Design a protein around this ligand. Structure first.
Ligand SMILES: [Cl-]
Ligand SMILES: [Zn+2]
Ligand SMILES: [Zn+2]
Length: 263
């Protein structure tokens, strides 16, 4: 059973990007004059928490115009149908992950036969592609296809202005290798290893100032939030941590590949 995340205080990360997630599953709110964009619906049990966080910041849940996700796995997309019903937000997903979203996880190349990983089925209002942009009220998000973890895992990026300076925010979708995933001669997802390697190439050459991810633990949410409360110069601007994390996971992939190929 996936550990139920604990509530986390919502806050502004930089520019018009706010954190409205939990102490684990990370969710983001981009506020614009023409509505807001929400990233990651998390677990069903988390929807009320996400709505509450958005309202705590002084915004309206009803102003959610677009719903996005890091990748198609229950812990990041299970609550999407509820959010669509409750806000009428337009659901946009990377083409490669659409099948999983429509089938509620039944078509998952790895978890197709694990009902504990299934989630409510939902329709995709707009199919996204590598490098496509999502724009609203002047804000521009770019969807980067960084496959492997899921066929259509998306790494979202955007430029934020903070304290007069410009910073590239990167929400790493995930390039982690889940326990059991087969990297060699995968029957259902043959290009899995090839995809991970492509993601490593993309991520390792990607400008990254404001380091974020689908999971709080990826970018040290807790400690950075504490520094933020202490009033430190945006502790979320962490290009060094981003570089190191990407390299670490890139190496974690090769460690698993090595294990599967020679262990
Ligand atoms: Cl990790
Ligand atoms: Zn996942
Ligand atoms: Zn996850």
């Amino acid at each position: 059973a996936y550990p139920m995340p604990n509530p986390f205080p919502p806050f502004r990360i930089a520019g018009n990007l706010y954190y409205v997630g939990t102490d684990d599953l990370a969710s983001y709110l981009i506020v614009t004059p023409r509505g807001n964009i929400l990233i990651n619906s998390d677990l069903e049990a988390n929807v009320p928490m996400i709505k509450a966080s958005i309202k705590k910041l002084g915004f309206k849940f009803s102003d959610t115009k677009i719903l996005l996700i890091s990748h198609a796995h229950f812990d990041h997309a299970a609550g999407s149908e509820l959010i669509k019903q409750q806000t009428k937000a337009k659901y946009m997903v990377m083409d490669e992950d659409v099948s999983v979203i429509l089938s509620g996880g039944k078509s998952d190349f790895h978890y197709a036969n694990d009902s504990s990983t299934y989630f409510t089925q939902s329709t995709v209002d707009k199919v996204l592609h590598d490098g496509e942009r999502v724009e609203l009220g002047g804000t521009v998000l770019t969807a980067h296809l960084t496959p492997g973890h899921t066929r259509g895992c998306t790494t979202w990026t955007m430029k934020l202005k903070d304290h007069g300076k410009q910073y590239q925010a990167v929400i790493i979708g995930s390039i982690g290798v889940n326990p059991g995933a087969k990297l060699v001669d995968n029957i259902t997802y043959p290009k899995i290893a090839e995809d991970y390697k492509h993601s490593i190439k993309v991520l390792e050459s990607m400008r990254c100032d404001i380091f974020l991810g689908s999971h709080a633990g990826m970018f040290d949410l807790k400690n950075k939030y504490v520094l933020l409360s202490k009033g430190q110069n945006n502790p979320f601007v962490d290009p060094t941590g981003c570089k190191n994390y990407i390299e670490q996971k890139a190496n974690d992939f090769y460690t698993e590949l090595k294990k599967q190929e020679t262990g």
